[PDB]
Design a protein around this ligand. Sequence first.
Ligand SMILES: CC(C)=CCC/C(C)=C/CC/C(C)=C/CC/C(C)=C/CC/C(C)=C/CC/C(C)=C/CC/C(C)=C/CC/C(C)=C/CC/C(C)=C/CC1=C(C)C(=O)c2ccccc2C1=O
Ligand SMILES: CCCCCCCCCCCCCCCC(=O)O[C@H](COC(=O)CCCCCCC[C@@H](C)CCCCCCCCC)COP(=O)(O)O[C@H]1[C@H](O)[C@H](O)[C@H](O)[C@@H](O)[C@@H]1O
Ligand code: HEC
Ligand code: HEC
Ligand SMILES: CCCCCCCCCCCCCCCC(=O)OC[C@H](C)OC(=O)CCCCCCCC[C@@H](C)CCCCCCCC
Ligand SMILES: *C(=O)CCCCCCCCCCCCCCC
Lengths: 54, 158, 223
Amino acid sequence: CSPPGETASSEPGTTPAIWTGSPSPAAPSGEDHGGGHGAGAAGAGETLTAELKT
Amino acid sequence: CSAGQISQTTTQEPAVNGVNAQAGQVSLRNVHLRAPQQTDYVEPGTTVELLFVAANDSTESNKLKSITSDVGEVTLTGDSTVPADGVLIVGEPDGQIQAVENAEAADAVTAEVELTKPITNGLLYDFTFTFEDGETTVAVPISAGEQPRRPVPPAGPG
Amino acid sequence: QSALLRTGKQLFETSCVSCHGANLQGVPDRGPSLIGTGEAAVYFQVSTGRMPAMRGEAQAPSKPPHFDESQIDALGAYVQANGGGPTVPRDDHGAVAQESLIGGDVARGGDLFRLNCASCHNFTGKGGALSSGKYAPDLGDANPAQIYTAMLTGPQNMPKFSDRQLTPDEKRDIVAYVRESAETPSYGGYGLGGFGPAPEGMAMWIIGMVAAIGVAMWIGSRA
Ligand SMILES: CC(C)=CCC/C(C)=C/CC/C(C)=C/CC/C(C)=C/CC/C(C)=C/CC/C(C)=C/CC/C(C)=C/CC/C(C)=C/CC/C(C)=C/CC1=C(C)C(=O)c2ccccc2C1=O
Ligand SMILES: CCCCCCCCCCCCCCCC(=O)O[C@H](COC(=O)CCCCCCC[C@@H](C)CCCCCCCCC)COP(=O)(O)O[C@H]1[C@H](O)[C@H](O)[C@H](O)[C@@H](O)[C@@H]1O
Ligand code: HEC
Ligand code: HEC
Ligand SMILES: CCCCCCCCCCCCCCCC(=O)OC[C@H](C)OC(=O)CCCCCCCC[C@@H](C)CCCCCCCC
Ligand SMILES: *C(=O)CCCCCCCCCCCCCCC
């Protein structure tokens, strides 16, 4: 005997798409904190940058 | 009888990243792309260089190298009709030595491509090299010539 | 260098143009093109002697080198100029580096060797067999530059370990482990080659068992 599933010459295939990993659900819910702050508004956190251009 | 007409040693491609395209009178060797990528893709609009060596097989010559352009608009700066029983070295693969203080025809036929399409290392991208004798698709790879590892960020256990 | 390039060309033209055609392009079905192989490939291959090759077979065997260090450098420079590629390491003076390639860490080198090298060579760099007439040779003859360049350019049926895949520090550690395992004396007696079960069983059956049987024949009486 030989393995039932082999030798699919047809269907050349396609290049895999860029992987976009989903965030870890409640199972591995652990994630890095984005920054603690008072946040007396809708929420900004302790991380905010900006680029002053010309 | 590993020495018969089909022997392992003889039927071996060079251990180089560039592909070989023997189709046509002029043979293309070590044809690759120097496209240093800082992320998943080399974004369109950035110029990456096209390395290869065109060796002439016949002395009777095929020194035209008309267009050799594909998706990306490959342009041949300092183009010259070099191949006459010899080599046309378009660029300087990493580790290349100039071999003399001066130079001939300024750059030695440097081929550069404005991508107009994302590319990434590990993929094969078709290039149609067309000499007056004929045209051949080569399926050039992306090669990181001599650049060492780019430092990946340290991992924070979670 | 100009004269180095000229010497490399002269050696090439009267050594290998029959199988690595002039212009460094490969002769179809006799030898691969040397464009892009680099100086490291030439150094390793010619210094080990494999390249003055007088047969097409399963594997090109090692042999005494046909060129001295200066001619090896000339050929390597010629091939590097023609194709452009990996370069053999060198020390401060300019000679091919031997001691500088001995990595400081040997445990790391051994781990990397086992993960990557022992796969086919051995636990300690003795030889190994391959599919059809091929074989991974013993590493005890190779010098640090030869080991480093062997990794840098996969010679034949050997994976090509780029600097990105094995940073030169990792390759230096592997070189240190190879040299240490090769030059280290067998603790516990004569290591019968480096393969445990087979040489050990043969030595049992030939040394211990013939001794026991001969002593039994001496003590007892034939009948
Ligand atoms: C599955 C299977 C057995 C396939 C065939 C493989 C096999 C055993 C082939 C034969 C090996 C030989 C004899 C190769 C030489 C070339 C050859 C075939 C010549 C013709 C043979 C012939 C008819 C010759 C005329 C008379 C004759 C029969 C001479 C035989 C010569 C020999 C080699 C005799 C002794 C037998 C022998 C040593 C066989 C190899 C087997 C083993 C397991 C050796 C173990 C061993 C090894 C492998 C070490 O590396 C080592 C390193 C350091 C210390 C110790 C050892 C050690 O003990
Ligand atoms: C009867 C009881 C007595 C038992 C024998 C005890 C002998 C004690 C010897 C002295 C103490 C131990 C020395 C240990 C130092 C040591 O190990 O010894 C090597 C040598 O080794 C060799 O070559 C072998 C040389 C030949 C002499 C020994 C042959 C004895 C065999 C025949 C005994 C088994 C019986 C088998 C019967 C076979 C017939 C079957 C039908 C020498 O170095 P080297 O040679 O360079 O080893 C290479 C590394 O360098 C290099 O990297 C590495 O890559 C390797 O290439 C390595 O070989
Ligand atoms: C089977 C896959 C393979 C692996 C993986 C491999 N080798 Fe090799 N090695 C070979 C083969 C086959 C040769 C013979 C090449 C030739 O003769 O052209 C060789 C040649 C060598 C040589 C030349 C020895 C001499 O005396 O000529 C050395 C040294 C070496 N390898 C060490 C290493 C090192 C260091 C690594 C790093 C992990 C490694 N090997 C990984 C198969 C492998
Ligand atoms: C057919 C006889 C033969 C001759 C003679 C010969 N080569 Fe080769 N060459 C080969 C073969 C076959 C290979 C690939 C298989 C191998 O190396 O075992 C090769 C591969 C090479 C490689 C390694 C290519 C790679 O991708 O790693 C180098 C370097 C090289 N040759 C240079 C030379 C130089 C320099 C000479 C002359 C000093 C020479 N060769 C003489 C046949 C030959
Ligand atoms: C039935 C058992 C008896 C045999 C019956 C009649 C046996 C009659 C045997 C016809 C054999 C025909 C072969 C046809 C070759 C082929 O088309 O394939 C090519 C292959 C690719 O080429 C090879 O790879 C090697 C081919 C050479 C074989 C060397 C063998 C040398 C033997 C020595 C090692 C000595 C051994 C001791 C042997 C000792 C015996 C001495 C006679
Ligand atoms: C490669 O491994 C070997 C190549 C040899 C091919 C030619 C063989 C010629 C025939 C030899 C005869 C052997 C003895 C026959 C016994 C009956």
